[PDB]
Write a protein that binds this ligand. Structure first.
Ligand SMILES: N[C@@H](Cc1ccc(OCc2ccccc2)cc1)CN(O)C(=O)CCCCC(=O)O
Ligand SMILES: [Yb+3]
Ligand SMILES: [Yb+3]
Ligand SMILES: [Yb+3]
Ligand SMILES: [Zn+2]
Length: 610
């Protein structure tokens, strides 16, 4: 029938569709508000459309103007994490394809779940405040009224007035800046996004930003203190974009800038169009965490051009993006490395399945988010079970070259559209019309709808994994007479990627005896490594193995940065260790007011506080 976006309270795409957004607002750090008007050009999809519903969350609505006049509107009661529905009465009944512009004057709440307002003390420079948004999945409604569903795509133009000493950037092409004629001291930045996008891709950052150009269509932005390191770390960006274009077809967004956010940014990155956001935890100093950049770049095709129609089909966004990500890395560092990463991904899937449990509905590839807060369901499953399905199909259908042909055709077929798993599978059969018999060998029901690990495991090259297995198994099975023989020389020919995999394998078998972990630090000096992925896994292993010396290190890492991938598991391990439990809870309570709103909520749920 009709696919329903169970995370939105707005009129569905089958009733009306927002085609354009014109945003005029001002950022006020003193009151922690964004105030302005949202001009929505809406297209009816039915005859006699007299009213529509938009999503909003903690928004103050002053008025709604249609054709210069103020119109009637009502706000329903709040529906938990979904916000409150906003019904707007149209002064004229619209018929199919007729359009109307609705201008809504609104003001965001300082507690907006889409935004994090940082005091100057929270920034690198200590002299200016900072602001950044994160709308995916459903927080756009916490910034402005909209049909907050990925099934709707719109273009947008924006004008943002900020303290003249600060810079504003958006998920759009920079369209110049000028003094705010209205009231000086403030400056106005203009933006234009001509490619239709789902509203979760609307992004804004305001702060003391500086840039460094690192490619013909790439500038790196961050506070002054991080510019140089960021410019160094992400130097391979243009080369990855060229590979991605070869894999997915032309890059259509124009600019591909990067913004290195403050430590509290909740994700590794966010594929905001024209301006990817990345965590500063990627600044390892050796470009080793660049797969995250390859990943956000890939989203420019899978996710931003071809978009999941509802969050129940989120794997379409992530599985294909991880698949592309790994091909980019394989083009740059070798097919063996692609397989090494693919296998590590299967290990992360094992971990997620174990955490949730093999019968947990959240381990299905296609999920049902009815009455489920997306932020709560988020996990590695759509990334890794989705990637595994695509990798398995690649092997079943003839190899990477053949499957990549499908990927490029898929992107072209559904560019600028929002689709479901059935659209994807129906096209796969259409593309592989000469291999229907092979496609019919796939246990689709299990892959798409069953919980747990996939029904079949792909084949993986083992070249780079073998040394990690050997070393991890030696530690897992080590006895007293083996401790003196481990030596720093064991790490001699291991890349940071392999050290991380070694730790991941060892962590799957934690706890290790306390004496064994103490010995590991003595011989490998992992406390000295600052690569966040490695430090994260090493501290988890230490805490899970009951080393009290590691408590302050883990509490430090969990609070000095806020990438949820790290912060949530660290607090969770600290809460599970009897020795650090009270300190973990007190540390969270002491820091929650200064944390990102979504991270604060999830860690509180994880710690069972309140
Ligand atoms: N799409 C963004 C990340 C992101 C941001 C926000 C959400 O929203 C939660 C959600 C969305 C859809 C379904 C269920 C839950 C989901 C993913 C880019 N991205 O996928 C990555 O950066 C992956 C790297 C992971 C590293 C990390 O620690 O974040
Ligand atoms: Yb007011
Ligand atoms: Yb106000
Ligand atoms: Yb022995
Ligand atoms: Zn992604």
């Amino acid at each position: 029938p009709e696919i329903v976006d169970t995370c939105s309270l707005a009129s569905p795409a089958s009733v009306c569709r927002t085609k354009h957004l014109h945003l005029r607002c001002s950022v006020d750090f003193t009151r922690r508000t964004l105030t302005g008007t949202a001009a929505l050009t809406v297209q009816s999809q039915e005859d006699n459309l007299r009213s529509l519903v938009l999503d909003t969350k903690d928004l103050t609505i002053e008025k709604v103007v249609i054709n210069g006049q103020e119109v009637k509107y009502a706000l329903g009661e709040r529906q938990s994490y979904k916000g409150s529905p906003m019904e707007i009465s149209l002064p004229i009944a619209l018929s199919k394809n007729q359009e109307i512009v609705i201008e809504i004057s609104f003001e965001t709440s300082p507690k907006s779940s889409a935004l994090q307002w940082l005091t100057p003390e929270q920034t690198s420079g200590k002299e200016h405040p900072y602001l950044f948004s994160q709308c995916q999945a459903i927080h756009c409604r916490a910034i402005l009224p909209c049909q907050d569903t990925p099934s709707v795509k719109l273009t947008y133009t924006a004008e943002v007035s900020v303290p003249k000493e600060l810079v504003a950037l958006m998920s759009a092409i920079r369209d110049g800046e000028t003094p705010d004629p209205e009231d000086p001291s403030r400056k106005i930045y203009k933006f234009i996004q001509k490619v239709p996008i789902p509203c979760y891709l609307i992004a804004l950052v305001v702060g003391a930003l500086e840039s460094r150009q690192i490619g013909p269509r790439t500038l790196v932005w961050s506070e002054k203190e991080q510019v140089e390191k960021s410019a160094y770390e992400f130097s391979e960006t243009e080369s990855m974009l060229k590979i991605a274009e070869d894999l997915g077809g032309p890059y259509v967004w124009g600019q591909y800038d990067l913004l290195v956010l403050p430590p509290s940014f909740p994700y590794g990155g966010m594929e905001n169009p024209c301006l990817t956001f990345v965590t500063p935890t990627l600044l390892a100093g050796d470009k080793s965490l660049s797969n995250v950049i390859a990943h956000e770049i890939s989203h420019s095709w899978t996710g931003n051009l071809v978009t999941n129609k509802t969050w129940d089909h989120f794997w379409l966004n992530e599985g294909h993006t991880v698949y592309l990500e790994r091909h980019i890395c394989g083009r740059l560092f070798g097919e063996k490395f692609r397989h090494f990463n693919a296998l590590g991904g299967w290990g992360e899937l094992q971990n997620s399945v174990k955490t949730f449990g093999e019968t947990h509905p959240f381990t299905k590839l296609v999920v049902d988010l009815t009455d489920i807060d997306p932020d709560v369901a988020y996990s590695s499953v759509p990334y890794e079970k989705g990637f595994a399905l695509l990798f398995y199909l690649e092997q079943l259908l003839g190899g990477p070259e053949i499957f990549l042909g499908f990927l490029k055709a898929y992107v072209e077929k559904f560019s600028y559209k929002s689709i479901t798993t059935d659209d994807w599978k129906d096209f796969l059969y259409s593309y592989f019309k000469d291999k229907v018999d092979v496609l019919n060998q796939v246990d689709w029901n299990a892959w798409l709808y069953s919980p747990g690990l996939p029904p079949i495991k792909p084949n993986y090259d083992m070249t780079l994994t073998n040394a990690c297995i050997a070393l991890s198994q030696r530690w897992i099975t080590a006895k007293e007479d083996d401790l003196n023989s481990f030596n720093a020389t064991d790490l001699k020919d291991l890349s940071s990627h392999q050290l991380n995999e070694f730790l991941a394998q060892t962590l799957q078998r934690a706890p290790l005896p306390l004496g064994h972990i103490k010995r590991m630090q003595e011989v490998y000096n992992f406390n000295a490594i600052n690569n966040s992925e490695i430090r994260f896994r090493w501290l988890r292993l230490c805490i899970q193995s009951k080393w009290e010396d590691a408590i302050p290190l883990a509490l430090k890492m969990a609070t000095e940065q806020g990438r949820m991938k790290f912060t949530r598991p660290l607090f969770k391990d600290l809460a599970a260790f009897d020795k650090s439990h009270d300190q973990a809870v007190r540390t969270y309570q002491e820091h929650k007011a200064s944390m990102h709103p979504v991270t604060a909520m999830l860690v509180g749920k994880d710690l069972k506080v309140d």
